[PDB]
Tab-separated table of C-alpha atoms and ligand atoms in Angstrom:
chain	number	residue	atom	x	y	z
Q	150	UNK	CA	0.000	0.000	0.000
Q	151	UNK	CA	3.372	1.994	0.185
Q	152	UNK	CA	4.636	3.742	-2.500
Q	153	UNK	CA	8.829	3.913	-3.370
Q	154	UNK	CA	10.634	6.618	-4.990
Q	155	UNK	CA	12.154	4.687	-7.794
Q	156	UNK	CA	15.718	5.286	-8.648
Q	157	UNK	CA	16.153	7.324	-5.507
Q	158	UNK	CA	19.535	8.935	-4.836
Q	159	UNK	CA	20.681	8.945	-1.699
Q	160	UNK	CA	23.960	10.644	-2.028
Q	161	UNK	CA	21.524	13.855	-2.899
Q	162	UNK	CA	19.777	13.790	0.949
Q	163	UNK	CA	22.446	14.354	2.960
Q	164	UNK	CA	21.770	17.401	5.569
Q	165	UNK	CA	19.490	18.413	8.037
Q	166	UNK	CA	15.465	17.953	8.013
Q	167	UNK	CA	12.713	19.418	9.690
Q	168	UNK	CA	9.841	17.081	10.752
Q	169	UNK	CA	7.075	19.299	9.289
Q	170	UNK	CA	4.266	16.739	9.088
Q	171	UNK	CA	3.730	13.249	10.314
Q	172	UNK	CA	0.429	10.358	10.764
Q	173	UNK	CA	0.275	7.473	11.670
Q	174	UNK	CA	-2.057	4.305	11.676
Q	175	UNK	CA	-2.401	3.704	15.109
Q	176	UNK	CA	-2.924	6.998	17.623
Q	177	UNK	CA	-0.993	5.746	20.375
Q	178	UNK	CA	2.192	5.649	17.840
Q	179	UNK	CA	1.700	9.125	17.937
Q	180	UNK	CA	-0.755	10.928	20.668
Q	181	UNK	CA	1.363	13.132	23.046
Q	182	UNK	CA	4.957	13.778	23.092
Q	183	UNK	CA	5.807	10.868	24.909
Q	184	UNK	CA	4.679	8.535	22.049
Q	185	UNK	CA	6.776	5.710	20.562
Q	186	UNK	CA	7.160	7.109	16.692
Q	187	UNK	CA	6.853	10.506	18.121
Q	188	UNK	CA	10.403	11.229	16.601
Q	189	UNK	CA	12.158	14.268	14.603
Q	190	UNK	CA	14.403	14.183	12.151
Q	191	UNK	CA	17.362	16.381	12.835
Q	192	UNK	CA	19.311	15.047	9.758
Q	193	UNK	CA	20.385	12.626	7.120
Q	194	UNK	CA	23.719	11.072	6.642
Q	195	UNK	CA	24.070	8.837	3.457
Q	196	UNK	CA	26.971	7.105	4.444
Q	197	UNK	CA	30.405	5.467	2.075
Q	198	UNK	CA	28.855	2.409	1.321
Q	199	UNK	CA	25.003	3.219	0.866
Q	200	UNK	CA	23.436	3.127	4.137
Q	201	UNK	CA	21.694	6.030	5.816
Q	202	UNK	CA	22.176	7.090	9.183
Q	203	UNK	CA	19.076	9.028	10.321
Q	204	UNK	CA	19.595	11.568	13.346
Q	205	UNK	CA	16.055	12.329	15.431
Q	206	UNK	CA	15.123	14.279	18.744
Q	207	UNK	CA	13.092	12.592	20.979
Q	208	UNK	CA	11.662	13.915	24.262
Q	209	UNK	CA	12.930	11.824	26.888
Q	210	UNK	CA	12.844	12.559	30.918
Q	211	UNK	CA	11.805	16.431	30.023
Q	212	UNK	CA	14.680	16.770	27.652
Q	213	UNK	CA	15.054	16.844	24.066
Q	214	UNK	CA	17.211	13.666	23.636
Q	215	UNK	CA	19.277	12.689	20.215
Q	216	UNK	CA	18.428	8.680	18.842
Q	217	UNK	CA	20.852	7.895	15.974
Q	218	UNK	CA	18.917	4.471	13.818
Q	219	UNK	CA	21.299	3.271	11.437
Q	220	UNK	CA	19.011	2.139	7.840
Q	221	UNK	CA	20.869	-0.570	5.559
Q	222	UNK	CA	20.411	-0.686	2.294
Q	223	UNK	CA	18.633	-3.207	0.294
Q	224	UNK	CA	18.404	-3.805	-3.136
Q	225	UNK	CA	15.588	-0.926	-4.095
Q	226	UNK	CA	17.349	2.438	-3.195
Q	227	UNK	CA	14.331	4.206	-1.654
Q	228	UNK	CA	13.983	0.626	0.806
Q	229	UNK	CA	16.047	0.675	3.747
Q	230	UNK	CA	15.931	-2.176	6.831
Q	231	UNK	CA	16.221	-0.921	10.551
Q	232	UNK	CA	15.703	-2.364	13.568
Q	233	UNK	CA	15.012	0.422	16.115
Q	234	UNK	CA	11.135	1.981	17.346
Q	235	UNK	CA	10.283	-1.551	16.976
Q	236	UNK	CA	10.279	-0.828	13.039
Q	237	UNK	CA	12.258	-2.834	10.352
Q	238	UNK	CA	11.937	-0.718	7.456
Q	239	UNK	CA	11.729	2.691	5.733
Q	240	UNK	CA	10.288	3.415	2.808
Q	241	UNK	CA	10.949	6.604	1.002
Q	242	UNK	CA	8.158	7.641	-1.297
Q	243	UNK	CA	9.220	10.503	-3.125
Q	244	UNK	CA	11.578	13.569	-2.698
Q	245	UNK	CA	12.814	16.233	-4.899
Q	246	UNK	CA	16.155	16.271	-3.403
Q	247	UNK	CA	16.126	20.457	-2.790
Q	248	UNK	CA	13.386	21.052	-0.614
Q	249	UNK	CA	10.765	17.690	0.881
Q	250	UNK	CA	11.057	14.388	1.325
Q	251	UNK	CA	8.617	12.242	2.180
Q	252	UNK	CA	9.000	8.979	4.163
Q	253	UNK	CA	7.371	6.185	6.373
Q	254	UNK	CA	8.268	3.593	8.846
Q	255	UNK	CA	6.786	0.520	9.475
Q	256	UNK	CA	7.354	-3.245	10.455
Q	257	UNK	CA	6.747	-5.723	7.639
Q	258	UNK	CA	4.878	-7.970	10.320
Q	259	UNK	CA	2.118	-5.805	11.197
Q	260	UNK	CA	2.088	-2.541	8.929
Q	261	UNK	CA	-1.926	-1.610	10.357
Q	262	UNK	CA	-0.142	-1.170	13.621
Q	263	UNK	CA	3.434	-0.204	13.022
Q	264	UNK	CA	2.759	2.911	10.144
Q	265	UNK	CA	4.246	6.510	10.487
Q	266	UNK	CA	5.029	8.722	7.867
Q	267	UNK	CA	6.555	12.117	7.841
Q	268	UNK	CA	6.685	15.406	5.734
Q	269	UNK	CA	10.488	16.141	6.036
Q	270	UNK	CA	11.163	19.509	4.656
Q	271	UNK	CA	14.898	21.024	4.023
Q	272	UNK	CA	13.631	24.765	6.035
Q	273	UNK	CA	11.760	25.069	8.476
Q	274	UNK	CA	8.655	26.581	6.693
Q	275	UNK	CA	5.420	25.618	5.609
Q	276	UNK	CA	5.718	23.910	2.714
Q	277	UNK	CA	1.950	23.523	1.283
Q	278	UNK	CA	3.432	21.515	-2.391
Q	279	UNK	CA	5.054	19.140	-0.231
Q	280	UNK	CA	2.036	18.692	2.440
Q	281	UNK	CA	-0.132	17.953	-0.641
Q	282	UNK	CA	1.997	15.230	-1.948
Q	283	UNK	CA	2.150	14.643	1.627
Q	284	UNK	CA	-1.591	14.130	2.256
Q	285	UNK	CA	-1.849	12.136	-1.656
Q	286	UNK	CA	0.243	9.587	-1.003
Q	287	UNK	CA	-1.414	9.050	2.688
Q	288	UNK	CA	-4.657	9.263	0.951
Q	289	UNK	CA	-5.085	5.696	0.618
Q	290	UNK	CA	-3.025	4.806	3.808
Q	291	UNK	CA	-4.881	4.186	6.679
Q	292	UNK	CA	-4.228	6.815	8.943
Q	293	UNK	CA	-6.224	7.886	12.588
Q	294	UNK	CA	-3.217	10.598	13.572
Q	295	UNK	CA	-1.851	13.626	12.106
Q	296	UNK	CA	0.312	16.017	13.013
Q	297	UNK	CA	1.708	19.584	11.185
Q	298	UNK	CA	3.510	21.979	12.911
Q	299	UNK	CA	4.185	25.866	12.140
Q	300	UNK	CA	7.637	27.555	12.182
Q	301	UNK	CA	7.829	28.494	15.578
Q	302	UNK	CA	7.344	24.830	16.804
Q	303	UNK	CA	10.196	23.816	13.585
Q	304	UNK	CA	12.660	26.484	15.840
Q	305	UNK	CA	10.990	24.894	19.304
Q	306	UNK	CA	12.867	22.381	21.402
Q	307	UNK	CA	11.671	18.519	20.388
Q	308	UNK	CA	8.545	20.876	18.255
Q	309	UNK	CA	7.030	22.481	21.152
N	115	CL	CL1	9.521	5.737	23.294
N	116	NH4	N1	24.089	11.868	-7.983
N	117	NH4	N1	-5.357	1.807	15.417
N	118	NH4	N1	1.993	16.096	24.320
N	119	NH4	N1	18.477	0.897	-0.243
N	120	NH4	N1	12.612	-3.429	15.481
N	121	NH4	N1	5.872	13.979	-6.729
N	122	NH4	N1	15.345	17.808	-7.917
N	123	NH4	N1	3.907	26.880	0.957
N	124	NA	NA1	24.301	15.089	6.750
């Protein structure tokens, strides 16, 4: 139900991201700040041999606390296999390299009660285009959360 960026270049992603939308299937994955997928991107780091190192913020014990999840590679470039947020893959659906990307998480076991997707943008603005594409590819997805947050909250600590 998940769509892939095909042909996706990762060497083109590298930098940091602002977590500027984000759903997911099950509330609880992401209802108050305490939530398990309830993670911010803070950047991307393609690394030598393909794999992607993805830096988040996470509020932990009233503190805005850094979670580094290492993705490997797999043989579709927008595919990448984790095991961290009790997730094992991410999907990247479509990006245009400058300015969005769009992504979601999920474990191949149970996806119903595993999905999150985020709205990554490279400023931390409002970024309607990409919260479209956002909303069209969730369109089908079934989704009971979602999140977007304003510029002040992309500038807050953990987006308060
Ligand atoms: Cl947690
Ligand atoms: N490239
Ligand atoms: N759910
Ligand atoms: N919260
Ligand atoms: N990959
Ligand atoms: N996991
Ligand atoms: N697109
Ligand atoms: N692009
Ligand atoms: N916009
Ligand atoms: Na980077």
């Amino acid at each position: 139900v998940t769509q892939t960026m095909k042909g996706l270049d990762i060497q083109k992603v590298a930098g940091t991201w602002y977590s500027l939308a984000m759903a997911a299937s099950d509330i609880s994955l992401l209802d108050a700040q305490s939530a398990p997928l309830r993670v911010y991107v803070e950047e991307l780091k393609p690394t030598p041999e393909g794999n992607l190192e993805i830096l988040l913020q996470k509020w932990e014990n009233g503190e805005c606390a850094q979670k580094k999840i290492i993705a490997e590679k797999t043989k579709i470039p927008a595919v990448f296999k984790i095991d961290a947020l009790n997730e094992n893959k991410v999907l990247v659906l479509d990006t245009d390299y400058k300015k969005y990307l769009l992504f979601c998480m999920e474990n191949s076991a149970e996806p119903e009660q595993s999905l999150a997707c985020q709205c990554l943008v490279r400023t931390p603005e409002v970024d309607n285009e990409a919260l479209e594409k956002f909303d069209k590819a969730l369109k089908a997805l079934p989704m009971h959360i979602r999140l977007a947050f304003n510029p002040t909250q992309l500038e807050g600590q953990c987006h308060v």
